[PDB]
Design a protein around this ligand. Structure first.
Ligand SMILES: Cc1cc2nc3c(=O)[nH]c(=O)nc-3n(C[C@H](O)[C@H](O)[C@H](O)COP(=O)(O)OP(=O)(O)OC[C@H]3O[C@@H](n4cnc5c(N)ncnc54)[C@H](O)[C@@H]3O)c2cc1C
Ligand SMILES: Nc1ncnc2c1ncn2[C@@H]1O[C@H](COP(=O)(O)O)[C@@H](O)[C@H]1O
Lengths: 319, 255
């Protein structure tokens, strides 16, 4: 059988989730004889063959379509023709913003198995069994795909480990199907707002979330951060509201705090997208009055207490 | 000119929730229901378009779900939505994102809107699939994770920004009519937490039990279970000693 992996690139760079999927594909296949087919789609995608000529890639298909980077019409058509050509049992996509643009459309047209944001996957005999979350990550939902000879999964980033080393795939080139897209990509943009600190470089962060309540409560945490020698960061609602600059936002849409050794998460529930930015931090402290908050499932230390009472006592003790 | 907004009433779980006897779902007694957070932003964006226009803009909210959902639809009307539609039959129980996409499309075919808005994802199941499935069945232009929309009623193109990983956006010009999935932060909804809801059956939209429900979904739930998750070291005591422990942790880090 074949497992098809759709790689991902943007602005001339391969997104590393690509290699995670290759890891996932190789771990999943039932037999030594099974092959992992990787496709990279774009008008300039030949540039990525060195970076995709890696361990665990049996076949590498460069698909030239009309757009440089992601376009949902181009991708759906291309991946549909890849599935037709290679007849894979399983197709692995990243659960990425790009995939969100087409994955479920692909699955609506045909009788393909489909599940998204999957973080456990295995074969039980010849049965594909995938696990995803339910009810804001409070449960696991385990699913199968009865009678589906092709199953499309989107795979949660930063779960599956990449393989190490080079590979020697059979490289091929195909044209994407010729249909005119109903959209056209224009500029990439980074929005305004202050940018006095690169939070990917800092080692000690205090991060505030929706639990702070009103914007007038921001200042006391700024003061605490300053007294402690920490960098003040935030979850998405704080930055969406304009209360702290976007440059201080931690998570998928914001930044990954790769240099951070100590992260104090105050009034932050620990959504998957926030975790994406900080779950690697070696010492996480969570301060949150909800013992059921997801953040406690990754924190080393937890304080189930009011953040304002904690902040004021912390400030006083630091002085 | 009409904007159709697909909305979901999501479930959140109370503490000490239990899996129901059949193991396929959580016991409904532990569920609290409210409008999906993403739908606040998508509804607000439709209302902003309605208010910016001298041309009439009909804003129609549509939800596929049982009768509990009327409470959320009623609240949408109270915020100024013109019409609200609930689609249901008990056969639709267990319908995944793709089946719900199909059901929504049958309503949209009749409404013939100029734009369709959906949320990026639902706070409960977080499929991030339903809106783009609608786009497939409609065969309409589409974009997911829209954080900005430049659009005037009757324009045959719009300019959107999709919110990408790592602190960047991409501007995209998209043909209209289109389906867009709308991201948090696109606007600041004004209502931060007697015209009836229109009740529609599967028969009303030409569907039967064979078109919907768990048997027509694109995956089958084997079980739902409370996993063993990681556990923090909970610091008990007074505020003063909780703060004292944090400082010791800070000092350990600093030395
Ligand atoms: C494509 C996409 C990208 C995203 N990217 C990001 C991202 O980059 N960063 C990000 O953060 N999110 C991101 N999200 C948004 C995410 O889904 C959540 O909405 C967000 O992370 C929730 O933020 P929060 O934890 O601050 O708010 P909430 O989930 O509402 O949590 C508030 C918490 O505060 C607690 N609380 C309230 N009062 C107190 C008190 N007095 N004392 C102590 N605790 C209190 C509550 O118990 C609660 O846990 C993204 C989502 C999508 C779909
Ligand atoms: N039952 C439903 N009725 C109407 N819209 C829905 C329903 N389920 C999902 N949606 C739409 O899809 C979004 C949630 O995405 P998803 O996680 O794919 O369910 C919601 O914000 C709605 O716009």
């Amino acid at each position: 059988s074949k497992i098809l992996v759709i790689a991902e690139h943007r602005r001339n760079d391969l997104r590393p989730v690509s290699l995670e999927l290759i890891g996932a594909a190789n771990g999943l296949k039932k037999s030594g004889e099974d092959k992992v087919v990787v496709a990279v789609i774009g008008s300039q995608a030949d540039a990525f063959v060195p970076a995709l000529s890696v361990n665990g890639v049996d076949e590498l298909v460069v698909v030239k379509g009309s757009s440089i980077d992601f376009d949902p019409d181009v991708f759906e058509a291309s991946v549909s023709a890849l599935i037709a050509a290679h007849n894979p049992s399983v197709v692995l996509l990243p659960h990425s913003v790009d995939s969100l643009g087409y994955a479920s459309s692909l699955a609506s047209k045909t009788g393909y198995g489909f599940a998204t944001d999957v973080y456990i996957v295995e074969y039980q005999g010849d049965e594909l069994v995938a696990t995803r979350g339910g009810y804001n990550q409070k449960v696991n939902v385990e699913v199968d795909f009865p009678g589906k000879s092709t199953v499309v999964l989107t795979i949660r980033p930063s779960v599956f480990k990449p393989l190490e080393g080079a590979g020697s795939p059979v490289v091929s080139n195909v044209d994407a199907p010729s249909v005119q897209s109903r959209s056209q990509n224009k500029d990439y943009v980074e929005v305004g707002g202050g940018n006095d600190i690169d939070i990917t470089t800092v080692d000690f962060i205090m991060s505030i979330g929706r639990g702070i309540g009103e914007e007038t409560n921001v200042e006391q945490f700024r003061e605490l951060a300053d007294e402690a020698g920490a960098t003040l960061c935030c979850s998405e609602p704080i930055a969406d509201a304009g209360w702290l600059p976007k440059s201080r936002q931690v998570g998928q849409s914001g930044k990954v705090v790769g240099s951070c050794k100590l992260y104090v998460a105050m009034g932050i529930s620990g959504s998957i997208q926030h975790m994406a930015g900080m779950k690697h931090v070696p010492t996480i402290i969570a301060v949150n009055t909800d013992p059921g908050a997801s953040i406690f499932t990754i924190a080393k230390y937890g304080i189930v207490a009011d953040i304002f009472d904690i902040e004021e006592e912390l400030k006083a003790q630091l002085a | 000119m009409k904007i159709l907004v697909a909305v979901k009433q999501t479930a959140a779980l109370e503490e000490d929730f239990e899996i129901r006897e059949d193991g396929m779902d959580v016991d409904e007694d532990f569920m609290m229901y409210d409008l999906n957070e993403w739908d606040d932003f998508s509804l607000e964006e439709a209302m902003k378009i309605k208010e910016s226009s001298d041309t009439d803009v009909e804003v129609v909210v549509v939800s596929v779900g049982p009768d509990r959902v009327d409470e959320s639809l009623r609240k949408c009307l109270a915020k100024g939505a013109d019409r609200a539609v609930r689609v249901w039959d008990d056969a639709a129980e267990g319908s995944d994102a793709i089946v719900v996409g199909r059901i929504l499309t049958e309503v949209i075919k009749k409404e013939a809107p100029d734009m369709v808005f959906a949320g990026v994802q639902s706070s409960d199941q977080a499929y991030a699939s339903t809106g783009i499935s609608v786009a497939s069945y409609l065969n309409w232009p589409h974009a997911a994770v829209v954080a900005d929309l430049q659009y005037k009623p009757g324009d045959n193109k719009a300019v959107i920004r999709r919110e990408l990983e790592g602190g960047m956006l991409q501007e995209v010009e998209i043909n209209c009519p289109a389906v867009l999935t709308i991201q948090l932060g696109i606007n600041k909804p004004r209502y931060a937490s007697t015209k009836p809801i229109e009740e529609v059956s599967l028969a009303d939209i030409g569907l039967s039990a064979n078109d919907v429900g768990a048997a027509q979904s694109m995956s089958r739930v084997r079980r739902m279970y409370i996993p063993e998750k990681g556990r923090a070291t909970m610091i008990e005591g007074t505020i003063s000693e909780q703060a004292a422990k944090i400082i010791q942790i800070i000092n350990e880090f600093k030395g």
